């Protein structure tokens, strides 16, 4: 990021990128231009020798549609918090879930990848109204062990009995929830667990997915040394994985693994495999594959500010009734990109 | 704000805040996350030794809803103007009304307050296409007397006979109008007056409110010394106060009073009372209370860039037919906030 202001113990960092992106696919819903850009600001103030306040905002703007189009810009991150020296930190706002603390180790692909879960999907990705307490080095008991708690308020429907001020469709609603994460150490190990209540609308509107609570168990491994990046994570979810547009999967088992190697002159080829199998689906669907594909691609870094990449996604899904009904794409995609980062 | 550029007699100031805010209320329309942020820029150029040009833009972005939501960002202020040394100043664009010059003395509450009037409501708040002439020290006469003139153009319907390029609903339309303000430091005293024409659609579509002109008379007082802040203002309006969603009140009387004290270590407790009584309403409503509540809260300032506050609004409105039909909330609200200002 570019530090554009540093006075009176307060600093402002401006960051973002402009991505000229194009998709080559046989699926007309994804083929074509995909240009966009990101912009954001990071702040930090020194309250005293052992207390610090900060805030971060991240905003996404799409630029692949006409000037008369609608809903082309949205906010990704917005939160403010405090740091109590080495006793931990606390922040509130729109932030990442604690499950991301483990599932982001495999989210390093050029363009694709990291899509066994969705945004605004309980505590697996960016969410609304999450209060996170993070402690580094586990107070003083041990060294190198990160730890975190989280709590999220209800985000109900647009109107009705379970409504809140920020209503939304059943695909992004949730009740009260909490989560924890635990990472320890170039080999690193991680574990995350989240538990959220399910709204009444999610149990009645969609055809698939019935239950009272949404739970997630995640285990992770990571190797990062000698210009070698190996990472894998296995996740088992309960009434928490979207089965396309048909609802939620009663049981899901996600597994994604990535291998990367960074070359001396800036080339970073990567190979990855992702899968997501649903179980006990209603309507006679039985066990179905929600996602299954192999990702092959590479990235070239001219410097820290400019880069280009090519990403090839080989979709291994088989077209059938479930995929067509749920609107899950089963076509190969090739992505070309040219990114300027500031 | 953060001055990020100062060269060639032109300076740019970047300002804003990130507010992690949560509401605790029994009203489902307001309960839940309320996280948002503001971003804006203030500019000023030195044309010569006695002429100065400037411009200011303010943007509000809501970050309490999902990434697929609509209409989460809007503009609060946008105007450009000139300063003729000490002879006055002129600016045009989207700016505050002259009534705000007196009614802002009571808009100092932590989270609530300043809701006896709405935005885009004639010349009482932020408005479109307002040309404002502001003069300090009242030409060359008595010192300490601030004077202001304003004129606003017509903002008509979306389509039809009285349409303009920027159409809108009857609750935000207006005709040609003007306003004046006058504040003096003696402890401060102020007076404001506005007069606007009412569109034809405003006189036919809503059930309540019939008249040709919108009138507003405002008087205020303020005490700000010795870490004590006292302020109050009384406003009498004619066909200018919204009676919820039912239309406009033929006669309305607004009264606000606020008391605050600033402690040496950073605590700033505040107590305030607000009311708004409507008279001569149609449909047999008679005299109704549009707004009535008591506000108690406090604010803690870590420094000029970080703060947190708690705000408690004790709603004294009584539920009846008018409140339910007009959609006026009658529930207590508790607000918790954590603000980073840059």
């Amino acid at each position: 990021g570019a530090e554009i202001y540093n006075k009176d113990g307060n600093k402002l960092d401006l960051y973002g990128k402009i991505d000229g992106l194009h998709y080559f696919s046989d699926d007309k819903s994804v083929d074509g231009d995909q240009t966009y850009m990101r912009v954001g600001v990071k702040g930090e103030t020194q309250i005293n020798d052992q207390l610090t306040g900060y805030g971060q905002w991240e905003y996404n703007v799409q630029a692949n549609n006409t000037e008369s189009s609608s809903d082309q810009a949205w906010t990704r991150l917005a939160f403010a918090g405090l740091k109590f020296g080495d006793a931990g930190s606390f922040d509130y706002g729109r932030n990442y879930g604690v499950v991301y603390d483990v599932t982001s180790w495999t989210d390093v692909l050029p363009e694709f990848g990291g899509d066994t879960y969705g945004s605004d999907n309980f505590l697996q990705s960016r969410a609304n109204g999450v209060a996170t307490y993070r402690n580094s080095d586990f107070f003083g008991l041990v060294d190198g062990l990160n730890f975190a708690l989280q709590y999220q308020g209800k985000n109900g429907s647009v109107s009705g009995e379970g409504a809140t001020n920020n209503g939304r469709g059943w695909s992004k609603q949730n009740g009260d929830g909490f989560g924890t994460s635990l990472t320890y150490d170039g080999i690193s190990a991680g574990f995350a667990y989240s538990h959220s209540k399910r709204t009444d609308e999610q149990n009645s509107v969609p055809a698939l997915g019935r239950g009272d609570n949404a739970e997630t168990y995640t285990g992770g491994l990571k190797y990062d040394a000698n210009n070698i990046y190996l990472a894998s994570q296995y996740t088992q979810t309960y009434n928490a994985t979207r089965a396309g547009s048909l609802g939620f999967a009663n049981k899901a088992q996600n597994f994604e693994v990535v291998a990367q190697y960074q070359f001396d002159f800036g080339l970073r080829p990567s190979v990855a495999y992702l899968q997501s199998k649903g179980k006990d689906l209603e309507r006679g669907y039985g066990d179905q594959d929600i996602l299954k594909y192999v990702d092959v691609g590479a990235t070239y870094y001219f410097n820290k500010n400019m880069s280009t990449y090519v990403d090839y996604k080989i979709n291994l899904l088989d077209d059938n009734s479930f995929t067509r009904n749920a609107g899950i794409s089963t076509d190969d995609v090739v992505a070309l990109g040219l990114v300027y980062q500031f | 704000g953060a001055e990020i550029y100062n060269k060639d007699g032109n300076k740019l100031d970047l300002y804003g805040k990130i507010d992690g805010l949560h509401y605790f209320s029994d009203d489902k329309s307001v309960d839940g996350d309320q996280t948002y942020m503001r971003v804006g820029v203030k500019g000023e150029t030195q044309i010569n030794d006695q002429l100065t040009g400037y411009g200011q833009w303010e943007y509000n972005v809501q970050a309490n809803n999902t990434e697929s939501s609509s209409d989460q960002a809007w503009t609060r202020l946008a105007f450009a103007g000139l300063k003729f040394g000490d002879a006055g100043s002129f600016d045009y664009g989207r700016n505050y009304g002259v009534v705000y010059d007196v009614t802002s003395w009571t808009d100092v509450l932590p989270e609530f307050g300043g809701d006896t009037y709405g935005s885009d409501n004639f010349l009482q708040s932020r408005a479109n296409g307002v040309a404002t002439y502001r003069n300090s020290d009242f030409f060359g006469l008595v010192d300490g007397l601030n004077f202001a003139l304003q004129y606003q153009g017509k903002n008509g319907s979306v389509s039809g006979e009285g349409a303009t390029n920027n159409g809108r609903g009857w609750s935000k339309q207006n005709g040609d109008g003007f306003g004046t303000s006058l504040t003096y430091d003696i402890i401060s005293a102020g007076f404001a007056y506005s007069h606007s024409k009412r569109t034809d659609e405003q006189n036919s579509v809503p059930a309540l409110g019939r008249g040709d002109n919108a009138e507003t008379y405002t008087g205020g007082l303020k005490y700000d010394a010795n870490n004590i802040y006292l302020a109050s203002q009384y406003t009498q309006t004619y066909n200018a106060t919204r009676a919820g969603s039912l239309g406009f009140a033929n006669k309305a009387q607004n009264f606000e009073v606020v008391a605050q004290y600033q402690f040496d270590f950073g605590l700033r407790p505040s107590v305030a009372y607000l009311q708004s009584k409507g008279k001569d309403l149609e449909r047999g409503y008679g005299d109704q209370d549009i707004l009535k509540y008591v506000d108690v809260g406090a604010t803690y300032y870590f420094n000029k860039n970080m703060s947190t506050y708690v705000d408690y609004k004790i709603n004294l409105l009584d539920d009846n037919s008018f409140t339910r039909n007009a959609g006026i909330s009658t529930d207590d609200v508790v607000a918790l906030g954590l603000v980073y200002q840059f």
Partner: peptide
Amino acid sequence: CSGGQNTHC
């Protein structure tokens, strides 16, 4: 509508 990093659809 996808995992946080590179938004899809």
